[PDB]
Design a protein around this ligand. Structure first.
Ligand SMILES: Cc1cc2nc3c(=O)[nH]c(=O)nc-3n(C[C@H](O)[C@H](O)[C@H](O)COP(=O)(O)OP(=O)(O)OC[C@H]3O[C@@H](n4cnc5c(N)ncnc54)[C@H](O)[C@@H]3O)c2cc1C
Length: 303
């Protein structure tokens, strides 16, 4: 690894490279082992240089946002982890808004309101970054990143810049082309419609109230873990299986929303995975229905 470190240092400012860095310090779930290399670029060129280098030497690269939609094993991640959290700009021009993939979508949603632009109120409570939102076509309460996005600037695994328009992004229900061909999102552009701020505020206020009353927003958490099985709702099945409150390590099935797994007591990525297995097993026994995992689990098992 000496070799990679030395090489990376030839390509990007040294202080932007952290070695054997515990990811639990940065993930929304507060879990995750060591990242061999944790890079925080402040420019697109730096992302390109790192991706090209990794491609050339076959080093796996993991793109990360706020970690609100993954579970990283306690063994950490082998290779290079690029955090896009510093690519945070948000700029508005009339009805258009551009934002770096590291910017919090909630921050962009709040900028939209500041300019009396309607169309992103649905995102006032979605955790994470713009890059992650694009990756999953994040959506809530009838809204989707897809409603107002024009394009997303990305870097392919070979290190080239590619501007993908709305159609090319192939935004779908909880999916996109970012997933299918491992591109890294650098920036997203939107076009919104002028609106009446008091009305924009009222919608955000209602959606905030609604979500707060239904979700365990006060605990680090991973959101909706399972796919929805035919004829039922995963959270309802889990609840009817009397799994709410069931804990393993420091992670338990939320007593506020059975579809959520909260880190209530310094839990680990291992607890999450174990609890998932246990929930799948308990439900299958009670209803004969098999819940399939929706949230990706990455990284290595410890030891
Ligand atoms: C309490 C709670 C409520 C939630 N509510 C909603 C909701 O209402 N609607 C909804 O859609 N989702 C929801 N989520 C899920 C989550 O917030 C979204 O999926 C979000 O867009 C993830 O952003 P992130 O920065 O946290 O991504 P991460 O968790 O850091 O990563 C997610 C995935 O995207 C990739 N990725 C991350 N950044 C980039 C990038 N720049 N380029 C390429 N790939 C990248 C990663 O490799 C990984 O596969 C909720 C989560 C929680 C904990």
């Amino acid at each position: 690894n000496k070799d990679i470190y030395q090489a990376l240092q030839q390509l990007i400012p040294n202080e932007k490279i952290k070695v054997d860095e515990p990811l639990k310090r940065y993930t929304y779930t507060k879990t995750g082992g060591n990242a061999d290399f944790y890079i925080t670029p402040t420019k697109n060129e730096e992302v390109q240089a790192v991706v090209k280098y990794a491609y050339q030497n076959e080093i796996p690269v993991t793109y990360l946002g706020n970690g609100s939609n993954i579970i990283i094993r306690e063994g950490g991640i082998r290779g290079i982890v690029i955090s896009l959290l510093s690519l945070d700009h948000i700029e508005v021009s009339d009805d258009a808004i551009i934002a770096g993939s590291g910017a919090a979508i909630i921050d962009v949603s709040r900028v939209a309101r500041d300019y009396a632009l309607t169309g992103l109120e649905f995102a006032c409570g979605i955790p994470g970054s713009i890059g992650g939102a694009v990756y999953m076509n994040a959506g809530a309460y009838g809204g989707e990143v897809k409603d107002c996005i024009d394009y997303a600037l990305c870097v392919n695994e070979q290190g080239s810049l590619i501007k993908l328009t709305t159609k090319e992004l192939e935004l779908d229900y909880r999916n996109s082309i970012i997933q299918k061909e491992h591109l890294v999102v650098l920036e997203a552009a939107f076009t919104l419609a002028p609106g009446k701020m008091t009305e924009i505020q009222a919608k955000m206020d209602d959606l905030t109230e609604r979500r707060e009353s239904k979700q365990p927003l006060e605990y680090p958490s991973c959101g909706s873990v399972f796919q929805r099985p035919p004829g039922h709702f995963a959270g309802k099945l889990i609840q009817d299986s009397n799994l709410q409150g069931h804990r393993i390590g420091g992670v338990e099935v939320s007593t506020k929303h059975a579809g959520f797994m909260v880190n209530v007591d310094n839990g680990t990525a291992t607890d999450y995975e174990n609890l998932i297995h246990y929930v799948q097993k308990t439900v299958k026994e009670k209803f004969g229905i098999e819940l399939n995992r929706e949230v990706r689990i990455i990284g290595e098992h410890p030891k």
